[PDB]
Structures are given as structure tokens and as C-alpha cells.
């Protein structure tokens, strides 16, 4: 297990427009394609992303290049973020991949917003913060998501996702 099975199993496999728990146009193994209500919209956005007239329909091979690049994002940001670095930093690599998952969700602004878990996780105090990242809309809105993460926070092991 790594970070991209992790957020493969997260995240599923879809060739085709899809909507978000949110109800926005993704694709792929979720890649966001726009919060707009048009499906034209997101049509345009995927072009864009692929360099090609996709017509709402991608391959495999493509959607996992944008995963790649996702991916890739998702820790960028972790770094370059001044509350996230310092964390990341502090975690062993298991715990470094439930933060990049959770930022592969709910984007680098959201998860730099939870200084309390934050700070509990940098304290490693596993249980604490556990408890503390469950108080949120993420885990009521995608609680058995939100389960898999917390738990590797928790225990430092992958069993979430075996």
C-alpha cells in the first residue's frame, strides 16, 4: 500500500463524467473538473486537462495521468503550505499519506483550516487527535472515507485499507 492505492481505493476508477459526493463534474480516479453546474463547462475543463476534444470521456491510461498529477499537486501543496509543512514533516510516512489524502480531498485550504488536529497530530498524540478529526463535516459527509483516514492517523499502519 501507498498513496496512490490508497486514494485509488478512496477515490475509485471512472472513465466517464461523473458527479462528486458533492455533486460536482469529475472523472477519472477524482479529478475535479469544475464546481459549475454546466456539464458543457466541465467538458471544456477536461479538453483542457487532456489536450484533446475528449467529448466527456477519457481512458485509463489518461486518467491516471491526471492522478499522477494530482497527486503530485496534493504534496506541493502540502509543502509550500506554512501549517501543513510542519506537520507533514513531522509524520512518519504512513501518516504523511493520510494527510496528503485528506488534502487530495478537501484541498489545501481546508485542511490547513484544522489547526487543533494539526497541532495533536505534530504532538503525536494519535488518539487525541483521532478524535478531534471526526468532529467535522468531511466525517459526517464521507464518514466511512473519513474512518479509513482517522484510523491510519491512528495507528500509523495501513490496516484501513487492507
Same mark, same amino acid.
Given at each position: 500500500m501507498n498513496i496512490f492505492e490508497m486514494l485509488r481505493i478512496d477515490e475509485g476508477l471512472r472513465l466517464k463524467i461523473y458527479k462528486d459526493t458533492e455533486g460536482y463534474y469529475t472523472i477519472g480516479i477524482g479529478h475535479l473538473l469544475t464546481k459549475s453546474p454546466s456539464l458543457n463547462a466541465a467538458k471544456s475543463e477536461l479538453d483542457?486537462?487532456? %489536450?484533446? &476534444?475528449? &467529448? %466527456? =470521456? /477519457?481512458?485509463?491510461?489518461? #486518467?491516471?495521468?491526471?492522478?499522477?498529477?494530482? =497527486?503530485?499537486? #496534493?504534496?506541493? %501543496? /502540502?509543502?509550500?503550505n506554512a501549517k501543513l509543512k510542519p506537520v507533514y514533516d513531522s509524520?512518519?510516512? =504512513?501518516?504523511? #499519506?493520510?494527510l496528503i489524502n485528506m488534502v487530495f480531498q478537501m484541498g489545501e485550504t481546508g485542511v490547513a483550516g484544522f489547526t487543533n488536529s494539526l497541532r495533536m497530530l505534530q504532538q503525536k498524540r494519535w488518539d487525541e487527535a483521532a478524535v478531534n478529526l471526526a468532529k467535522s463535516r468531511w466525517y459526517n459527509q464521507t464518514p466511512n472515507r473519513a474512518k479509513r483516514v482517522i484510523t491510519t492517523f491512528r495507528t500509523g499502519t495501513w490496516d484501513a485499507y487492507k
Open positions: 483542457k486537462a487532456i %489536450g484533446r &476534444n475528449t &467529448n %466527456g =470521456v /477519457i481512458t485509463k491510461d489518461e #486518467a491516471e495521468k491526471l492522478f499522477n498529477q494530482d =497527486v503530485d499537486a #496534493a504534496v506541493r %501543496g /502540502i509543502l509550500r509524520l512518519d510516512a =504512513v501518516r504523511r #499519506a493520510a
